[model samples]
Target chain A: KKWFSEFSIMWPGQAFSLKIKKILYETKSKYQNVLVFESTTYGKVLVLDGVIQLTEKDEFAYHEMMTHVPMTVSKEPKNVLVVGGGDGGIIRELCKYKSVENIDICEIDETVIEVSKIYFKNISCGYEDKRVNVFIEDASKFLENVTNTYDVIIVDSSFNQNFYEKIYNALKPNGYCVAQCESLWIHVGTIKNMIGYAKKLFKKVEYANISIPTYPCGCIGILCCSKTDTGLTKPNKKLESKEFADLKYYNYENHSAAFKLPAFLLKEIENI
Target chain B: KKWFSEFSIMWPGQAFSLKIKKILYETKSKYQNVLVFESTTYGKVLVLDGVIQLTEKDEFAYHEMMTHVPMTVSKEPKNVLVVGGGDGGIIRELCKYKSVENIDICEIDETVIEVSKIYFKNISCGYEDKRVNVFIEDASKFLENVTNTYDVIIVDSSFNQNFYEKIYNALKPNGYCVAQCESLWIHVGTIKNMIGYAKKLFKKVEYANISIPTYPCGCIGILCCSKTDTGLTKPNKKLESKEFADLKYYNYENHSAAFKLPAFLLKEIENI
Candidate 1:
């Protein structure tokens, strides 16, 4: 009788079906728990570890764009810290930046990392790199202990989760926080919450919706917020200028167009 | 706890979180059905029946590109047969052609037509024009009965659906069929099937993938099959180049890029 019940149902033997191995916790507020599973969509649905979380479907697009855009904007981004991406997608994208020195992936779960290494080989590429430092601890707790500040801090965790409030406090003054905000459709309350919090916490907070085919509702929403608006008005020169090639998608022109909103959304922002 | 359980659990309240509504159903398939869902993401969620088919999430980049490219390459496309676009999204784009005389939308579903009129106000713009003639019957059935042919026959149907076979057969000699294929990630078998069918059906069958942000895994598979070889050509010269300024997206540069497939897809095509 529910609407979404009609959305992503897979019958038995329909390879791309979800199976719950375990249940950690379930409530109306937030379903928090862990489980192991197989996926016909992606090779292995690595829950905790595989380095970069490759879920049942597509996670690469999100991992690729979220990390690339910030670095593209913060030209010559050397040091990066990916908070909550234990599966290693953000770290993998961070490795692509030629100017990057170190990529610190602070994931909360050891299980996510373990499963990632055991199951998904391709997504774990960033873990093998010398520059990547996999930390098995709470990202917020880890941030307080860390001394070196990163040029870019990517929040690949669930938006407005318990840890998000800490990211604003810990970000390096000049560092940009391109946190993986929830889907543009799912998080109206989060948007209001972020707008309320980030308006005072950070200088500029921008939002973008990337089309990811496999994800629920066919889209992902990312929020890019920074303390300073350096080179924000102009485009990401490196990604846009095409000084370096080897990109099948997400070139500079797309980088600009992807962020363009519809008239109603623009008007909504004005009215808000 | 299932692994994916960590991801947002769809609540009953969040049913219309994205404000996505299934406006119409052209046809329903076991694997994927084709309906028009009104989404907040872009303009329309090309929902295959109940499921979200495509959205501004990435469909437009393909839809805009698919519709515009053939328009650009052909000599001024006046009489257009938008076969199977019961949703009228493609017809809306076609009506932008000032040179276009009458765009005949051969869609079978009266329900889809009725639903578009109720839910999708923007995509339904094409129906507002007296220039559009809605043949509310099977596209193939309509084509079989009708005598008048089209300069450009845009096969705007979802992949893995059966209705397109009729539209392909119905194209007039020297007419073009620029249909939007499914994504390479989601439906490889279907893509291969379509390619094989196109080879048998049309003389000049070209395929491309535009990086649509909201598609499965996040890209679209395109098939532009023509009865005649319009090779390495440019946009149609006969129609005026100027586009309506009201468009939120789509441009001449995009028209070219939309048709250009990535090397990987091109390589795959070679194997197939």
Candidate 2:
């Protein structure tokens, strides 16, 4: 196998690197750069737009935190919307919830799904589940005039500047929407901006964070905005030991712990 | 300015890098390689043995979590011992607690302390405090014959395989000790080893973690062991806003949140 080394610029001045055993596959898609590498330590890794999307070893931390936190926030998230999780890790997590009935994934690039299906079946297999439906369209436009309402909407893509209200409009009352906010270290200003924007449109807006070694700052933020004024930190559903059989990171303790922001963020967003 | 680069291996196959604007200082201490760099994004950074010790931008996250979690656990931590925090960040944090009467810091290499004193004033100024006493000796050997006992002992150095039990024995019967354990991602086995070892010595032991961008895995583990079976998870101290004015990371919420372990770790170390 040929040696492959990758350097990911986490920010302008900081970066993370990995030694790849070989390039499994790579293609420049219409939307972004997609790369799959067989990494020496992290196993199979997916990279998009020169950013780490997931790695076989630590993807569970991101997927479980992204999916389970929101699922637990709502008593029963029967109808779910996943935007731009083309890798299908989010869908794989949603499939674990027996209460979740219909899972709609809106991914702009169909090739991301195709690539993930071949190289990353552990995550992409969720697409084969009968409850899952795929929409190959830009999520911002997809949510723009959506006739269907969802109990939980998971924004797996980067935050769109103006379409947050559209996402808020698409969710049913009392529903919760969790989006992939930027890293706490590099993007506190962005998080503060998102919190400000969400507070104006939603009844309750709060931030939660989880540590993923592959992500920028080794941490990623979750913006959980609820339509109801009720407490969003508590999990409405109780989980059993057997239920956590597949989960690597998310747990009942972490469900509440994720909402605990660092001292700096709490002060920056005074409303919290 | 010329480009200066720093490389940190998170594990065998993964690494992180930072672009340094200039080299502040470089020297080989008796114990390890000491480096001080003016990083473009992270400001001043300190490195020991090719590993990041701390950075100006985010040292508070590490220093505060390491200091306050144990300080708050006990009702009154009048006397505290710090091992290998030559940068003095830990001492800086401990001095914030007015009740802490004596703080003794042990450093094998006086050079780390000397460098920090000149380059890192915010952290090194803790040395100027009347309560702090500097000890230039191997902490493992120093703790072996310690006639003085402490209410709290903070192990700011990497875990030494042979010295943990001696460190445990040096504490007062009801005293608590917190050490800078490795990260959960790359060093779960190491952390498990630490927890198992501490449990054999102390009446109660638990692991707490915090996210620091400059650290390996972008996270570091804090292992807290108490000589008494009294619950260490619930903090006895209540801090007001003015009390936390200087701290950037630690707060009442973070005090407890730091103890929240990931699902995998919780299951692995079932006793905690």
Candidate 3:
């Protein structure tokens, strides 16, 4: 009645559990399962496909890196696109940039948008930003007609190579793209393959790691790529004078530090 | 029957679980209950205090963090002490450094080393090394007999203020000591007290956070204190010379990166 276990793709033998204070929301869209719960200790948690997405306490760690790593890297991003981030966490991060003039998002599930907007208003407030544009369909469908226009593109929902090629074609020559990837601890081979493929399609590629307690393995990663040979480790648009307020995570030091992988994982890429 | 779950100060309502393939060992050692299980996904799991202490899959993160983090900071570490890490994981990590001449561990319980030596030979293998001296009793008692002799003293068994002065006196002039503290996300005040207490006694004090999937909040921290005015964020003794097994985790890069904490934490430490 009080405790629930989460069995992510972590390892067949491992599972993470959270004590439910109350089931704030539980329902499914035509696409997948959607649920939100307030936990006794972890604040409010958002779940998709029965996997933990974010907890209110540590949401910034995931949302900030997914958005700002590229947000800080690419040329002062004027126009940006987010795929599958209906919760508005990514868009909220985008709203922080005065340089960003227009925001675009493609989410298949409408319930997540409203549910997140209703219960987690602080996180989903970006949906109300005047610059934001919402699209209801697959991100691929939106990319099919657009090319070389977006300054920064972020994939917050999911992945595949066909999607990667589409991302490459849609990015401007100087455009930067960041996609959520799996943890280096559990999915070494999977991450290696994605990184390997990016090298073939993008002019520059780098990997960033983030530690989020709610996520399986307590860690996850982001894939950064660009059409130009710009270094991704260093940020191009410095925010020294910006009005970014009380940032919980994603500092300048973390930018370079995130790329440092352990020797075991680095060896996998080296062996290739 | 095939699965078992874990919960420990994680949150009011969260738990971590593992699929058990075999119950390798189970019993009590007077001080605490001990259990070892062969998990289908996470390899072998060690539980003390009825909680997950280390898993073979990601044990390197905690062991390396607790050991090599301080190992690289102190000036040419030649002698070290470990308090209450019965599994010998910390001692195993110390064996990597050629500069370490004498390694000592004072674990209150003898059963852990006995069990660790038999079931997990690779982990407890450090016990067989000539440099190691096992003190099977209260860690505090051993500290009474030695003063200003040790180069590095690591405490993983538990914590208290009485322990801090003992560690400070036991270390050499330029030596460093690291103690495992609570998770930053969970116990900010507790970490604050420990870190704050160090400031009054030690010349320099710093904190390092380690991500461990099995631990509460999937993370834990180490408090580094030294008697000398030396920086704790960068490695003084470079590991460019690979003296032993290639480090799976805890590289020179980790020294600075681990200290790069979030803004939320920086403010708390600042306010203190």
Best by DockQ, which number? 2
Comparing only chain A of model 3 with the true chain A, what is the TM-score?
0.95
For model 3, what is the error of residue B1's alpha carbon versus the real structure, in angstroms, after optimal superposition?
A: 4.0
Q: Rank the candidates by DockQ, best first.
A: 2, 3, 1
> Of the native A-B interface contacts, what share survives in model 3?
0.78
Q: Cα deviation of A156 in candidate 2 (Å)? A: 0.2
Error of 1 at A148 (Å): 1.6
Give the alpha carbon lDDT tens digit for every residue of B73-154 in model 3.
Answer: 7767888998888888999988888788999888889998898998888789888889999888887888988643888888
Model 3 Cα lDDT, one tens digit per residue, A102-209? 998988888888889988989999888899989888788888866438988889965667878888888877788898888887888888888887877997778878
The better-scoring model by DockQ among 1 and 2 is 2
Instruction: Summarize candidate 1's per-residue lDDT along B30-140 as a digit string, tens digits.
Output: 333445544433455555434444454444455566677677666767788876766667877888888888888877666666666766666677798989887767665
| CAPRI tier for the interface of model 1 | incorrect
Q: For residue A113, what is the lDDT in candidate 1?
A: 68
Give the fraction of reference interface contacts each candidate recovers. Answer: 0.12, 0.84, 0.78
How much does candidate 2 score in TM-score?
Answer: 0.96
Using all chains and alpha carbons, the TM-scores for the candidates as numbered come to 0.64, 0.96, 0.96
Highest lDDT scorer: 2
List DockQ, one per candidate, in order: 0.15, 0.85, 0.75
Which lDDT tens digits does candidate 1 get at residues A117-180?
6665667767888988888777768977887877888888764444445666666677788766
Error of 3 at A197 (Å): 1.7
